[PDB]
Design an enzyme around this catalytic site. Sequence first.
Site, PDB file in Angstrom:
ATOM      1  N   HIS A  37       0.853  -1.204   0.000  1.00 62.07           N
ATOM      2  CA  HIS A  37       0.000   0.000   0.000  1.00 62.07           C
ATOM      3  C   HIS A  37       0.886   1.250   0.000  1.00 62.07           C
ATOM      4  O   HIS A  37       0.437   2.336  -0.107  1.00 62.07           O
ATOM      5  CB  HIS A  37      -1.008  -0.003   1.214  1.00 62.07           C
ATOM      6  CG  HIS A  37      -0.520   0.466   2.587  1.00 62.07           C
ATOM      7  ND1 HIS A  37      -0.080  -0.368   3.634  1.00 62.07           N
ATOM      8  CD2 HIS A  37      -0.432   1.749   3.080  1.00 62.07           C
ATOM      9  CE1 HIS A  37       0.191   0.422   4.681  1.00 62.07           C
ATOM     10  NE2 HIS A  37      -0.020   1.668   4.362  1.00 62.07           N
ATOM     11  N   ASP A  86      -0.003  -7.357   2.036  1.00 61.94           N
ATOM     12  CA  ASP A  86       0.529  -5.952   2.026  1.00 61.94           C
ATOM     13  C   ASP A  86       2.084  -5.998   2.118  1.00 61.94           C
ATOM     14  O   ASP A  86       2.828  -5.813   3.150  1.00 61.94           O
ATOM     15  CB  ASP A  86      -0.132  -5.092   3.131  1.00 61.94           C
ATOM     16  CG  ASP A  86       0.176  -3.601   3.091  1.00 61.94           C
ATOM     17  OD1 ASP A  86       0.500  -2.902   2.078  1.00 61.94           O
ATOM     18  OD2 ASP A  86       0.129  -2.792   4.098  1.00 61.94           O
ATOM     19  N   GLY A 114       5.195   0.336   6.079  1.00 66.54           N
ATOM     20  CA  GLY A 114       6.296  -0.311   5.266  1.00 66.54           C
ATOM     21  C   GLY A 114       7.601  -0.615   6.008  1.00 66.54           C
ATOM     22  O   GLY A 114       8.463  -1.332   5.521  1.00 66.54           O
TER      23      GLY A 114
END
Length: 223
Positions: free
Chosen positions: A40, A84, A178
């Site tokens: 994402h 993700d 992240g």
Amino acid sequence: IVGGYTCGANTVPYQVSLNSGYHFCGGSLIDSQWVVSAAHCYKSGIQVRLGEDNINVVEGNEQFISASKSIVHPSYDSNTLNNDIMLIKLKSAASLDSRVASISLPTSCASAGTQCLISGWGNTKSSGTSYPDVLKCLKAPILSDSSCKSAYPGQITSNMFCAGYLEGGKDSCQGDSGGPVVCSGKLQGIVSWGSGCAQKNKPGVYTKVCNYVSWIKQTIASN
């Protein structure tokens, strides 16, 4: 990172910053030319910043390298955030030293109770907003499977896990996405999502990296 501490300059040597003109996501360096982040966090035009502490000042240990290609996980679902995870290849190999180093991929998934380190330059407030310039750290345990599913009914898949404090007050937040969850010297998670930051009963959720090892290794051998 809410309720965390200042890590100290270059003490998380695998932490990277993704910059598109400003920092927007964190990542982890896993080798000389490959970074892992959250799918994402994908965007066109990324520069990878290595060896950063204060991301608004050139302190002398940075390596700024442009991304040559990005690869979002094939089965990434951006509505439920399953899988993700994404890979970024660097245009040139980083130069590794004590202050810029890769982190190791796990061989085995980590159990609940295990204490990990989470790091990032995301927001440090649970209500309202204050972004730190220097990297922030938080030690947190991996929570049980059960607890994670009862905190987020219907939303936790086999590729997510929760970590943190169900009492609240310590959590990852906006801008940390992240970034790394390291446990016993390896990369177990990736900061993925949550419900606000540092709320009672709602711990952060992370991508389970152990499930993806095979895909990473096949992908970096051919690309």
